[PDB]
Ligand binder design. Structure first.
Ligand SMILES: O=P(O)(O)O[C@@H]1[C@H](O)[C@H](O)[C@@H](OP(=O)(O)O)[C@H](OP(=O)(O)O)[C@H]1O
Length: 158
């Protein structure tokens, strides 16, 4: 709750995380609500700074390496990546393409919670899609155009 938020912030303070690291953490939290579209736009804007780009990619990597009951860290890190890939600096997709082998290993992520529900299949499902996104240059270009087309329409109508 505000209690998960509180602990998250204390962690931020202890580690002296940057603004970009704080944002990525929030977007990829264990909370059962999705990364907010506007927070995600702020992270996209930060991918054009070399320090913030390094921080963002490093924190995504960390989150992607989580396990078990923290599966939402991994799933949301994939969601964030897909968004950055389509809408941030093109450098994000270049780096993700070069590290495809690591997303590929998530095809075998497993987690069954205490009620016996398979939550890990969510990670496998998303990992397959992200790998299909990265392997296709033409689709990558078409998605980046469509994101700009969206931004352009939201700006002639504002
Ligand atoms: O309660 P525990 O067992 O200590 O486990 C933590 C808990 O799930 C938090 O909700 C989570 O932070 P978020 O809410 O930010 O997802 C945190 O992730 P973190 O270690 O990667 O920050 C965990 O370590």
């Amino acid at each position: 709750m505000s209690t998960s938020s509180l602990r998250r912030q204390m962690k931020n303070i202890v580690h002296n995380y940057s603004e970009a690291e704080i944002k990525v953490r929030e977007a990829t939290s264990n909370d059962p609500w999705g990364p907010s579209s506007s927070l995600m736009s702020e992270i996209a804007d930060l991918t054009y700074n070399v320090v913030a780009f390094s921080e963002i990619m490093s924190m995504i990597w960390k989150r992607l390496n989580d396990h078990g009951k923290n599966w939402r860290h991994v799933y949301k890190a994939m969601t964030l990546m897909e968004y950055l890939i389509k809408t941030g600096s093109e450098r994000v997709s270049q780096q993700c393409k070069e590290n495809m082998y690591a997303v590929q290993t998530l095809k075998d992520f497993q987690y069954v919670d205490r009620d016996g529900k398979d939550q890990g299949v969510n990670v496998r499902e998303k990992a397959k899609q992200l790998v299909a996104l990265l392997r296709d240059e033409d689709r990558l270009r078409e998605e980046r155009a469509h994101a700009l087309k969206t931004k352009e329409k939201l700006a002639q109508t504002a």
